[PDB]
Amino acid sequence: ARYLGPKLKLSRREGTDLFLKSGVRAIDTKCKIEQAPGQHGARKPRLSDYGVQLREKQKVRRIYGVLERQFRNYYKEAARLKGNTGENLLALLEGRLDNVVYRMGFGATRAEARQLVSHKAIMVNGRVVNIASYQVSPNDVVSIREKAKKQSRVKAALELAEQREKPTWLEVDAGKMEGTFKRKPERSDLSADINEHLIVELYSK
Amino acid sequence: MVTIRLARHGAKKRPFYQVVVADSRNARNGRFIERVGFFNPIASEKEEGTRLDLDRIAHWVGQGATISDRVAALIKEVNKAA
Amino acid sequence: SKEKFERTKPHVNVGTIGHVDHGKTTLTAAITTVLAKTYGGAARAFDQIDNAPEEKARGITINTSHVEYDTPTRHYAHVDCPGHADYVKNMITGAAQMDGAILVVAATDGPMPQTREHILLGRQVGVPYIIVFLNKCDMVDDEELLELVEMEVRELLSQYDFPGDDTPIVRGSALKALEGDAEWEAKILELAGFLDSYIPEPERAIDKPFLLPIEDVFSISGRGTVVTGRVERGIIKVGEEVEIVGIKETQKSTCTGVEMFRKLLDEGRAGENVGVLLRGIKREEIERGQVLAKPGTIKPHTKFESEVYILSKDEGGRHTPFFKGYRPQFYFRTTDVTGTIELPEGVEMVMPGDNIKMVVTLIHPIAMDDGLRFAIREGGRTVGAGVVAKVL
Amino acid sequence: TSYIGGEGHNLQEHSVILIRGGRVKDLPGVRYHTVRGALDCSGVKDRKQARSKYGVKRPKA
Amino acid sequence: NIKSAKKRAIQSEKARKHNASRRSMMRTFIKKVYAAIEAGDKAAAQKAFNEMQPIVDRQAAKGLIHKNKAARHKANLTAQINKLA
RNA sequence: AAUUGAAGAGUUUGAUCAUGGCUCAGAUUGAACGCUGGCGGCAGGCCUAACACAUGCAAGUCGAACGGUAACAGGAAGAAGCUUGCUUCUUUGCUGACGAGUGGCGGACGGGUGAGUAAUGUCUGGGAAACUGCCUGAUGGAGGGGGAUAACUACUGGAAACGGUAGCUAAUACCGCAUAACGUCGCAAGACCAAAGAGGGGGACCUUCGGGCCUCUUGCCAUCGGAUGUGCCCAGAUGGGAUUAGCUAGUAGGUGGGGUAACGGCUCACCUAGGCGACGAUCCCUAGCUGGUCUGAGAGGAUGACCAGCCACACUGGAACUGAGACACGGUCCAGACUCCUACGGGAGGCAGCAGUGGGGAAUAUUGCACAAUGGGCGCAAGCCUGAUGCAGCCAUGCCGCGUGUAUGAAGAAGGCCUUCGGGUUGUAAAGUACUUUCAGCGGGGAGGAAGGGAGUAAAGUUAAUACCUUUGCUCAUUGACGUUACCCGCAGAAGAAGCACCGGCUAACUCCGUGCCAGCAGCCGCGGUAAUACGGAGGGUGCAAGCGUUAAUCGGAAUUACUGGGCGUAAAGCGCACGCAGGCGGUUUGUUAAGUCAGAUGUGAAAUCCCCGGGCUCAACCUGGGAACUGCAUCUGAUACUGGCAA
RNA sequence: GGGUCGUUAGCUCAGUUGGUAGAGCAGUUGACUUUUAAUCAAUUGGUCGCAGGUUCGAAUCCUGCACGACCCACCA
Ligand SMILES: Nc1nc2c(ncn2[C@@H]2O[C@H](COP(=O)(O)OP(=O)(O)CP(=O)(O)O)[C@@H](O)[C@H]2O)c(=O)[nH]1
Ligand SMILES: *C(=O)[C@@H](N)CCCC[NH3+]
Numbered sequence A: 001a002r003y004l005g006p007k008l009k010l011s012r013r014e015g016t017d018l019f020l021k022s023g024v025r026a027i028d029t030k031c032k033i034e035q036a037p038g039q040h041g042a043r044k045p046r047l048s049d050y051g052v053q054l055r056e057k058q059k060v061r062r063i064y065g066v067l068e069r070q071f072r073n074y075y076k077e078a079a080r081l082k083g084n085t086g087e088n089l090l091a092l093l094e095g096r097l098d099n100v101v102y103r104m105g106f107g108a109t110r111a112e113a114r115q116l117v118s119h120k121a122i123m124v125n126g127r128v129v130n131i132a133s134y135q136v137s138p139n140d141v142v143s144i145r146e147k148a149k150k151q152s153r154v155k156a157a158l159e160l161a162e163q164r165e166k167p168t169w170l171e172v173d174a175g176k177m178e179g180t181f182k183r184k185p186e187r188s189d190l191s192a193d194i195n196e197h198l199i200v201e202l203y204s205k
Numbered sequence B: 001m002v003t004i005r006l007a008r009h010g011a012k013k014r015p016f017y018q019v020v021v022a023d024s025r026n027a028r029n030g031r032f033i034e035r036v037g038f039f040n041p042i043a044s045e046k047e048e049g050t051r052l053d054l055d056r057i058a059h060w061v062g063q064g065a066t067i068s069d070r071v072a073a074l075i076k077e078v079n080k081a082a
Numbered sequence C: 001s002k003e004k005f006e007r008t009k010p011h012v013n014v015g016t017i018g019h020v021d022h023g024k025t026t027l028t029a030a031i032t033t034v035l036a037k038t039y040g041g042a043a044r045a046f047d048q049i050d051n052a053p054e055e056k057a058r059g060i061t062i063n064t065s066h067v068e069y070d071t072p073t074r075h076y077a078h079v080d081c082p083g084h085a086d087y088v089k090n091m092i093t094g095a096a097q098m099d100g101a102i103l104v105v106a107a108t109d110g111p112m113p114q115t116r117e118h119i120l121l122g123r124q125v126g127v128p129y130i131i132v133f134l135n136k137c138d139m140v141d142d143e144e145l146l147e148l149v150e151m152e153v154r155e156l157l158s159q160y161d162f163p164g165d166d167t168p169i170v171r172g173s174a175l176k177a178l179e180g181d182a183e184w185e186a187k188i189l190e191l192a193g194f195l196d197s198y199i200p201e202p203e204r205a206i207d208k209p210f211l212l213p214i215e216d217v218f219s220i221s222g223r224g225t226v227v228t229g230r231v232e233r234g235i236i237k238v239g240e241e242v243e244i245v246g247i248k249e250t251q252k253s254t255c256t257g258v259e260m261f262r263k264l265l266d267e268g269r270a271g272e273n274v275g276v277l278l279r280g281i282k283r284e285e286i287e288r289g290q291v292l293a294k295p296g297t298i299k300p301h302t303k304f305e306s307e308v309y310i311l312s313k314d315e316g317g318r319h320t321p322f323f324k325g326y327r328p329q330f331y332f333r334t335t336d337v338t339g340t341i342e343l344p345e346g347v348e349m350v351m352p353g354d355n356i357k358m359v360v361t362l363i364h365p366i367a368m369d370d371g372l373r374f375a376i377r378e379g380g381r382t383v384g385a386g387v388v389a390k391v392l
Numbered sequence D: 001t002s003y004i005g006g007e008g009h010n011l012q013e014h015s016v017i018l019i020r021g022g023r024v025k026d027l028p029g030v031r032y033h034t035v036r037g038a039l040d041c042s043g044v045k046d047r048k049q050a051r052s053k054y055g056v057k058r059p060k061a
Numbered sequence E: 001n002i003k004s005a006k007k008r009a010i011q012s013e014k015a016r017k018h019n020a021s022r023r024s025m026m027r028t029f030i031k032k033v034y035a036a037i038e039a040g041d042k043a044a045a046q047k048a049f050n051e052m053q054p055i056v057d058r059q060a061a062k063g064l065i066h067k068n069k070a071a072r073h074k075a076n077l078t079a080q081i082n083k084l085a
Numbered sequence F: 001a002a003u004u005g006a007a008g009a010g011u012u013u014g015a016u017c018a019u020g021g022c023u024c025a026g027a028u029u030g031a032a033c034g035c036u037g038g039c040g041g042c043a044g045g046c047c048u049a050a051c052a053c054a055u056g057c058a059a060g061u062c063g064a065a066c067g068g069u070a071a072c073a074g075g076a077a078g079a080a081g082c083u084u085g086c087u088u089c090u091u092u093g094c095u096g097a098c099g100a101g102u103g104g105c106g107g108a109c110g111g112g113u114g115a116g117u118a119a120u121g122u123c124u125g126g127g128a129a130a131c132u133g134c135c136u137g138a139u140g141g142a143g144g145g146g147g148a149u150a151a152c153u154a155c156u157g158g159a160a161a162c163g164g165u166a167g168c169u170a171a172u173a174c175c176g177c178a179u180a181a182c183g184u185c186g187c188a189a190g191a192c193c194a195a196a197g198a199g200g201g202g203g204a205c206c207u208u209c210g211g212g213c214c215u216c217u218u219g220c221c222a223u224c225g226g227a228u229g230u231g232c233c234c235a236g237a238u239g240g241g242a243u244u245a246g247c248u249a250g251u252a253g254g255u256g257g258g259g260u261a262a263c264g265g266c267u268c269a270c271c272u273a274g275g276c277g278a279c280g281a282u283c284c285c286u287a288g289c290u291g292g293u294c295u296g297a298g299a300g301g302a303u304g305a306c307c308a309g310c311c312a313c314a315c316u317g318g319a320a321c322u323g324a325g326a327c328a329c330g331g332u333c334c335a336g337a338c339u340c341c342u343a344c345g346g347g348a349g350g351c352a353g354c355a356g357u358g359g360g361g362a363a364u365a366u367u368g369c370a371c372a373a374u375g376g377g378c379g380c381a382a383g384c385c386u387g388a389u390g391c392a393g394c395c396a397u398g399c400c401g402c403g404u405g406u407a408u409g410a411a412g413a414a415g416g417c418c419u420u421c422g423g424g425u426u427g428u429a430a431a432g433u434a435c436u437u438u439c440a441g442c443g444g445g446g447a448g449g450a451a452g453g454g455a456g457u458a459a460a461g462u463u464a465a466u467a468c469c470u471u472u473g474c475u476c477a478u479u480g481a482c483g484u485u486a487c488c489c490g491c492a493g494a495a496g497a498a499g500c501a502c503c504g505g506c507u508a509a510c511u512c513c514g515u516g517c518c519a520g521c522a523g524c525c526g527c528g529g530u531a532a533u534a535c536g537g538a539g540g541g542u543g544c545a546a547g548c549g550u551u552a553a554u555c556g557g558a559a560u561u562a563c564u565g566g567g568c569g570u571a572a573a574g575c576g577c578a579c580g581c582a583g584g585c586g587g588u589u590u591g592u593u594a595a596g597u598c599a600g601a602u603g604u605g606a607a608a609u610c611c612c613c614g615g616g617c618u619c620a621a622c623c624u625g626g627g628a629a630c631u632g633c634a635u636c637u638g639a640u641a642c643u644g645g646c647a648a
Numbered sequence G: 001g002g003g004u005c006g007u008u009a010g011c012u013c014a015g016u017u018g019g020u021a022g023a024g025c026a027g028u029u030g031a032c033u034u035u036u037a038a039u040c041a042a043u044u045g046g047u048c049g050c051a052g053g054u055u056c057g058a059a060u061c062c063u064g065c066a067c068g069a070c071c072c073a074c075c076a
Helices: A009-013 A049-064 A068-080 A085-092 A097-104 A110-118 A154-161 A197-202 B054-061 B069-077 C024-035 C053-058 C088-095 C113-123 C143-159 C182-197 E006-037 E042-062 E068-084
Strands: A141-143 A170-172 A179-181 B002-005 B009-011 B014-016 B020-023 C014-017 C065-070 C075-080 C100-106 C129-135 C169-171 C216-220 C224-230 C241-245 C251-259 C273-278 C291-293 C304-309 C329-331 C337-340 C355-362 C375-377 C382-391
Touching: A009 A049, A049 A197, A068 A085, A085 A197, A097 A110, A097 A141, A097 A170, A097 A179, B002 B054, B002 B069, C014 C024, C014 C088, C024 C065, C024 C075, C024 C182, C088 C113, C100 C113, C100 C143, C113 C143, C113 C375, C113 C382, C129 C143, C129 C182, C143 C169, C169 C182, C329 C337, C329 C375, E006 E042, E006 E068, E042 E068
Parallel strands: C014 C075, C014 C100, C100 C129, C129 C169
Antiparallel strands: A141 A179, A170 A179, B002 B020, B009 B014, C065 C075, C216 C224, C224 C273, C241 C251, C241 C291, C251 C273, C304 C355, C304 C382, C337 C355, C375 C382
16 A cells, blocks of 8 residues: 655655655755665666656655556546546545645645544544545545544644645644635646646556 | 336445336346336435335326335335325 | 264274284174164174275275274274285274274184284374284183183283283184174173273363364265364364365365264264365365364474384394384374484494384474374384474 | 476476466477476476566575 | 145146047037038038037136137138038 | 547668568456465356266245144043142044145246257337236126045055055035126127135024024126237348358148137148349358447447346257146156166156256355345235345455554664775664554444334224224334444554566666576567676666466557558559449439438337436445436438439 | 386486496587587496395395376275
8 A cells, every 4th residue: 555665765766855754854865865766876867758757657646655556547537527637637636635634734744644544533524534545525624533632743743834835725723723624726726846747648658 | 917116226235225117027126117216225314215206106006016015115105295 | 964963972992903814804793783682873794894895805804994883881983994914004094093902813813923013003003991802712612722822912912012911801703793693792792891891981182172183085975075083182063164284285174064974973072083074175185194183283394303112023023123214104193104214323223122212304294293102114014113202 | 389487397208287378489389388386397496586487485584 | 856746747637638528529529510511411510510609618718728719610610601501 | 517539669671761560568357377465345256068966955825715633732521640620631623723635826937057049039110910817997797506536444566666446525626507798600680608605703683503694805707908928020230151152842822721829831732833042042160149348539349257138948859738828947758868776577866046066177166044124926914935135154356445654763883785995875764762553353332224014902984883804193022144243432552464577678677796509588679609787696776566477368559451541553462455234323404202311309229337417335446316328210290402213 | 095017327218047237419628610510539427216125246026115007996
């Protein structure tokens, strides 16, 4: 399921950090960043067409921690939707419960956010969900099932989470520590550094 | 003989009895003249969980379609006045 | 399948052994003949036992036949043992299934070497309960001959470690016992009296996990693979799944029917001679030697450490010496796998008549357990006595 | 007729085996292979890579 | 085969000796009409038909005949004799 | 809202551009094999032998049709001990009820297989010469008699199987008579045909004290129907081969007789001499068919295991009976083969029903539970049967979801590995450390699937009745295979859960050593003859994930069978040339016809499945509502330019 | 489960009164040739399947055990 291995190796592999090692000390730097993905990280790749298509696909998938067989379902799901599949996919790659939990500020990392969902730590609209891949609808209310409220982690997460960019399509209580989700995601408010047209070619072949 | 009975569709442990009019001797999920409404044993508290057009039933009753008990119980459940 | 079996009275696996051709088939036929008048389950004829083709081809017991009977007090799952030299190896499976060995030797024949082969194997497998039956006694009405042969028996029982100081001897004749002539059937009744006399009720090893060395497996019509054999220790019941340990790499097998003498046993138990149907297994894989163990209880050992007594020429074995590297077959409660004599440092030669000890190099990875006393043969002849010290 | 993969089998005169597809295209005329790890045919001894093929189990110790 | 419906196995055998017997006289009365038709006697068949007409429809309701074959038996045979008489 | 949808590359040569094969990159599956493996949800699970089968079970029900009671339990005439009413007990069908038998009904259903079948089948839409148990609407009858037999007894053949004869006796069994209609024959008149009683309760009157009798429920018989199902027919569509070109004699049609439920060469008699066929007859091979599934942008191609319908079969071949209906899976008869039993005289057996066995094979599972729920069978009901079904078990076979932890962490360790031995890399990775516990494991709670039905009772109908029965509530006890359930609570503590393939290019990601055209690799081109990124190992890295690879088969890529959407001067391909039948295409003008054509509508295109738009499962898979679609086909009504037919 | 016949350098297969086992195909060792074929000689090579025993001595016989291709099986 989850990568659960050296989660910063991918940072050197994709150059741009993937916010995997966000946690507390945002000051990454402890991996000889950008120059040593492996024993031969000194070579320079010619990185062909199929290469740039794949490297992006991994970068996107590796940021949200999705798996290929499911991610393939996400493509066809984005394709069956009306409108541009590109934006249709970015929605699906954002509406993930744990990701929504992260986006609220409930979480130091995107993966730690999944640990909450796994451990029943969440209750949304009166329902406790274990499904990390939960497709949270626009304008719902994600909260914490009391047994896991501010248990040394939620506060630890929101502490650094106040220095977060704080997305626009959502709100947070922060008093009772409850996520107040709002409208759906939109291209401008989200990413804007990744490239969506690359992956659509990836599944075309 | 033609009878009005359920058809038991759905899946394991989450049945969905399909009330339908069939040639009595045929299979449970076998052939039928035509379907009419349905029944859901697990949608008790939601928008629906029990649909049925009592009009077409009466049309067939006039032909002799012997209603099976569980379905007959449904006509009382869709209340003769409610 | 038919007839739901009831565990009425305690079983005592008995059998007929001794030098080849002393009357053990007619005797076994006569044993059932006796109780036919008093007890229901008995009365098995000569041809009722002699059903095997080659066993018929000689008129002697070669294939290990089986019968059922019992006294008005305790049960007896009898073993019609073979006496022919080749099949003496096959009587060991029955000897290592037997609770009580009845030394069947005629008074007009005398304790022979083939008789002493069955004798060393008896103690070296685990049998202490022994009564003796002398046959063909109608021939020599010379009682002087009887008291020297009786002497030989108590000496020989002492010779290969059996309680000859407490062994009843029955100077009978089983042929006239099968003739219907009650007198010699009464001579059998004399031993029938001893039948409840010398042998008490042993221990049922039910408490410990299931365990069972395989005796017989057949291509049962309409059921498939049914394994038979007396339970080592532990119990079973229809619906539980045990593991097949043995020479092969260990895996599962389910109890899909347990029976006893074509009579439906409801639940298996230690000691009781059971016939059990197994799920999934086929005739090919399973055979004698392996073990039906309650899952994960036995390490598939490769080698072990033990001591081996060596018979001299007159003792029935080695008429000339040997040494380190020697390859005999060690019989583990039902098996016949080569346990090569690998004497550590120094001991590089063994003469006939020694109790040499060595860490063995077994050929096959068999289900091993420390402390097992095993009887050894080599090249068509017995070489002595053995006892497991350690296991690798 | 089929090719025998690896650097050493233990087959002879009989030793029943299993056949999978594929031609070697090197010693033409042979369009079949043999399965190492199948029946009497054991697996290639001392294999530490690509042991999915050649029927080699994981090194225990 | 073992089945309590072996009664149905022997009842069929029981009813068939009866049924064949019924059809036996019936077909012969039809043959009694043709004998008259092969005789040309306008009265004979008319007597024979008046004899078989009540004995034939009597079989129709009994389940022996499907009443249409019986109707045909009444029909053409009469259609033969009225055309002849 | 309901198809917003289509990629290439490596390989001929010294090199290039063509045509051209070839092979991989994608997806898929009843899959199998190998390495490997924690759990759960939901599906699938003998395509090879349509090979042969031990065991159990898979179809019985009604005492409210009848004679009877052999069992079990009561009442009772009587009985036996002795605590004379505590027990015992020979008789008795008087009851509750019930073996065996008569009979009504069902066994023609459900279930399984795909051998056969190239058209006696199916799909589609029409058609007339049909029948139709049970259900249901209407109109009427429902009188009165007789003769047998099973069971039961006696004797008796026989190893058994399985009978034979002589007596007993009933009915909704069977057969006469009466009476018959809009019923059947006939133009008509006439002629002629049916049957059955039981059960609950009951005041009066009446009791040869069986009951007559009253009342209601149910059933019977006949006619017309409808509904339903089935039979039958027409046209079209429905694999490959022309190295199969003539096929056939009940064959093609008429007439008369007969026959089927119904028309018909379905079958006969005689006459006529036809009928089919290159828009493929007959013959040979294969193969169930469609809805659908995989794939494909689409068109098409391949295919059609599962789920549903239709067809066909039941060891092999054929026949017929009972019956509404089979010319029949667990029915009968014959003949054969394969097996079993035997007293060897003679009989018995059919897993292609669910499990299971041997066997075949690369390979695919338990001789489990319950009738709790749906359905079906019989029954008034209660119930009883149900290997249909609902469930559990086994398999990673597929689809999907979750977990194997999070965070902090530089001596930037140990050791592995390369080294310009400076060092780099492994590697925030680990240890240490602060938290956390999902799923399992162990200890307790606890949904919903359950509607009914039972009994008692109230009230509205019923009726002479406050009795019975019917309809609607109330009440108590409760009825669950799964089930140590889903879910909830709590407990120890990161503790128990990540491997597999590849790294020359194709195609993501590299080095050092070992081996030297040897050993080996491989899908393709091709690598190895001493310094290999192509072999074998190690480290690193990449892909994917409870799976990862390989082989198999299908389509795509393949515009390398091209309708969409290809070519022939030389690459493969113009017949050597010409005339010419059928077939194909046809100037121009007006009119008409409306076959093609297009519009609109109607019926239909079964559902499920595919698509859109919602909902319920913690989510998803899945289930599921409504819509859309099923690109089609037949009819009716319009336009009638274009093409076709006709006239000039 | 039982009873008859089998196993030869690294490989195909020999050797009957039991007297100390053979080539052919691999290579290695030098010239030739880009490196091979052709061309040449020297040459190791079985532990006569594994174990003991009979004999002074075993490829030879005594059985057994691993593992084959044959004949009966047995039938909880
Ligand atoms: N005089 C006498 N002769 C007898 C007696 N018993 C048997 N015999 C005969 O001895 C022979 C052996 O019979 P059997 O019963 O097979 O012997 P066994 O002892 O089983 C032989 P195996 O050694 O093969 O198992 C037969 O000939 C039998 O008739 C007896 O008591 N007395
Ligand atoms: C078969 O008879 C067994 N169940 C009983 C014990 C004898 C085993 N050989």
